Amino acid sequence: QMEEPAAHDTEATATDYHTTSHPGTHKVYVELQELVMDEKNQELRWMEAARWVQLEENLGENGAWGRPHLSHLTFWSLLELRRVFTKGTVLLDLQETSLAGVANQLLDRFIFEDQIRPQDREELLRALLLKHSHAGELEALGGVKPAVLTRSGD
Amino acid sequence: KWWSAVVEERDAQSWTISVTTPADAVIGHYSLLLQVSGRKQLLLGQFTLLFNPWNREDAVFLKNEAQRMEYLLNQNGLIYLGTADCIQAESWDFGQFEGDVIDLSLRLLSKDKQVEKWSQPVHVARVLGALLHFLKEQRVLPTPQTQATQEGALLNKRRGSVPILRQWLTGRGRPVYDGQAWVLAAVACTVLRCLGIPARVVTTFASAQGTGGRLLIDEYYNEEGLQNGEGQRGRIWIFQTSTECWMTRPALPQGYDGWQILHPSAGSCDLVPVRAVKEGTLGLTPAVSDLFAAINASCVVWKCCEDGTLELTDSNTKYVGNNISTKGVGSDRCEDITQNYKYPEGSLQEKEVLERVEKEKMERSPLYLLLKAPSSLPLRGDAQISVTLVNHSEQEKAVQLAIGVQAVHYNGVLAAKLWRKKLHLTLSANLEKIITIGLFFSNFERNPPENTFLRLTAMATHSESNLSCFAQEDIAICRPHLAIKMPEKAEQYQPLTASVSLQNSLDAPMEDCVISILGRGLIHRERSYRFRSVWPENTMCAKFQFTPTHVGLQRLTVEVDCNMFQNLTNYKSVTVVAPEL
């Protein structure tokens, strides 16, 4: 009967993909987004929640940014971040310019390394393709609440 | 016709300028500066200038459009290997549109010091050929003498032409060994396509390399039919690769614009028109004679003995430089262009050319046999061969037959001795006799190397006389067929499934079966998987699922490695279209 192969990790041909370009220096602008649910019409959507232009700034419930401050974090953040970064997945120097291709490549790479089950690909791909809102529409959206995905899609 | 700039659209705050460039300018990195009447100059940005076949006023201008698509914008090519009887295509990834290839090529070109001549393709082609030949001579290591089957899978596998160029320029990667020294043509074609000059790699089969300009090749064989000693100055190679570039020659007399063969000399390189090779104008370039010698030359065989005297023998004529082929345009089928290099056999023009060349150069068997052999040998298998003898004399005669089979490299270098057999026959009243014998893979003295071809020699010695008859052939070893099944058309951002099938035709079970898949525009760098042991009876079948992202005509390559064989590759193409709106 039709049986599936088993994955493997190897470093025999890694050196063949080492570029020689000088990356250069650039400043960074970090933006954080999360899945939220808005009470007007019940659909999940990606919403921004913070920014890191010069010092960390947060966004309130009314829709206005708070006060800048230094970036303070917690102990458990470092622990779980290190634990998940130890067995993380990297895709360096990927040649893509669209969100759909990036999502497909990440899902396929996760499938390769047994990060997720084959039947979890569709739901994650559907979840990553929701609309990415902005700060202006918040008053037009009537408020948001955090949400969690489900296999059934509800 | 010169540098100019006209404002096309005017706004309150912005201007739209349309800059024009002359059709004959120096290529390289440029910078644009603006000068105000009072204030100092200010830099606006940087850009790079390249040749284009799309301009009617350019030296390199291609009339056809499909030819432009095949020879300049294509990145997936084919390289043809094997003997003249069986041709095996190998998928090559030129990768001329990588991030750093153009920068490396320009940095390498910047070591010419003849800047003013960078406006003509001849000078660039010459300097690039010479420098690439020098780099190949410096950076190619000889094959290891030790026997190591465990690491043999990593010495002969190729991932394209960009890693080779990077390792040659920087020396921080996997080196290339003597087993694959024909990749220089592929690297040159990659660089030429990167710079914007159309190029293609052709392969000549049964080419007499080595000697420069002579029309004679001297070869010596042992009493048993093997080759005493090692090496020679000019020998017969299995195949030889070369680069061809489409461009136009202004400095030459009228009638030589078109395709030019790049021929480096063991340094300074050069390029010669194909028509010069075909017609025979030996007084136009020093490298015309050497390439002409490589397409139509004659070989002589001398029979060594225990005494040591070289003895001429009656040998069946072997054909040199035939069935030269390259990749077809717009498809995946091979096209033979041997008619562009030599005239058809048995014509008046070819005999006139031969007698003219001979005139120019002069200024400066009672029995016979023939051999029937198969065109290919199954791996770990067997094949039958036949030798027939016919004598013409009133009286009976006894003859001694010696036959040898030995491996040889792709450049005529001997590899190992495998089989020998000697016997006696007696013919009477002029009756022909046929001897058909089988040859097995289990009868070899040792295990043949990875990339070798078998050479079979048969020699019959007459008893009372001294002259002897000789014949020889070359056979390549074939590997099991690797089938790929997948739909031809797919939609963007949608999963696609491909099936890979293999059958074990060997006599021993498979172990450590590992397959790798890759492809540009379909998958990332590469993905590898392991299999279970496969018996000599059963087959191996697998399926994979991925997602195309870029549109157009793509292809994917799969490769199989195991303990019995290594680097068994195959490819399959696909056409992917934009999603439905």
> What is the spatial distance between Cα B123 and Cα B114, in angstroms, rounded to a whole number?
9
Q: How far is CA B136 from CA B25, B126, B373, B545, in A?
A: 31, 15, 37, 40
> What is the spatial distance between Cα B75 and Cα B66, in angstroms, rounded to a whole number?
14
Q: How far is CA B181 from CA A83, A102, B164, in A?
A: 47, 39, 11
Q: Which two tokens stand for residue B432?
A: 């022909």
User: Reading across the β-sheet that carries A144-146, which strands appear in turn?
Assistant: A57-58, A44-51, A31-38, A144-146
Is B486 in the A-facing interface, judged by CB distances under 8 Å? no
CATH architecture of the domain with range B482-577: Sandwich (2.60)
H helices of B58-182, in order, are 66-71, 101-109, 121-139, 162-170
> What is the spatial distance between Cα B146 and Cα B56, in angstroms, rounded to a whole number?
57
Q: Does domain B367-478 have CATH number 2.60.40.10?
A: yes
Across the interface, do B530 and A10 touch by the CB < 8 Å criterion? no
Q: How far is CA B373 from CA B205, B233, B455, in A?
A: 19, 29, 11
Across the interface, do A5 and B525 touch by the CB < 8 Å criterion? no
Q: What is the experimental method?
A: cryo-EM
The residues, ordered by sequence, that sit 6+ positions from B411 with a Cβ below 8 Å of its Cβ are B181, B209, B235, B237, B238
Question: Residue B338, CB half-sphere, CA atoms under 13 Å: how many?
Answer: 18
Is B137 in the A-facing interface, judged by CB distances under 8 Å? no
For B118, the 3-state DSSP assignment is: helix
> What is the spatial distance between Cα B126 and Cα B109, in angstroms, rounded to a whole number?
11
Q: In chain A, what residues touch B170 (CB-CB under 8 Å)?
A: 20
Domain B367-478 identical in fold to domain B482-577: yes
Nearest to B108 by CA among B175, B174, B188: B188
- Comparing CB atoms, the residue among A19, A91, A104 nearest residue B547 is A104
Across the interface, do B173 and A21 touch by the CB < 8 Å criterion? no
Q: Which two tokens stand for residue B149?
A: 């089957």
Size of interface A-B (CB pairs under 8 A): 68
Resolution in A: 4.6
- Comparing CB atoms, the residue among B170, B493, B526 nearest residue A104 is B493
Q: In chain A, what residues touch B514 (CB-CB under 8 Å)?
A: 8
Q: How far is CA B40 from CA A112, A125, B3, B4, in A?
A: 58, 55, 22, 21
Nearest to B557 by CA among B542, B547, B568: B568
Q: Quick one: angle between helices B183-195 and B162-170, nearest 10?
A: 90
> What is the spatial distance between Cα B259 and Cα B272, in angstroms, rounded to a whole number?
9
For domain B65-364, give its CATH number from 3.90.260.10, 3.40.50.10310, 3.40.50.300, 1.10.10.10. 3.90.260.10
Nearest to B522 by CA among B482, B500, B552, B543: B552
Note whether A36 and A47 are within 8 A (CB). yes
- Comparing CB atoms, the residue among B163, B493, B543 nearest residue A16 is B163
Across the interface, do A96 and B549 touch by the CB < 8 Å criterion? yes
> What is the spatial distance between Cα A121 and Cα A114, in angstroms, rounded to a whole number?
12
- Comparing CB atoms, the residue among B515, B527, B530 nearest residue A112 is B527
Residue of chain A minimizing CA distance to B172: A15
* DSSP 8-state assignment for residue B366: -
Query: How far does chain B reach from its first CA to its final CA, in angstroms?
Result: 44
Q: Which two tokens stand for residue B110?
A: 């910047």
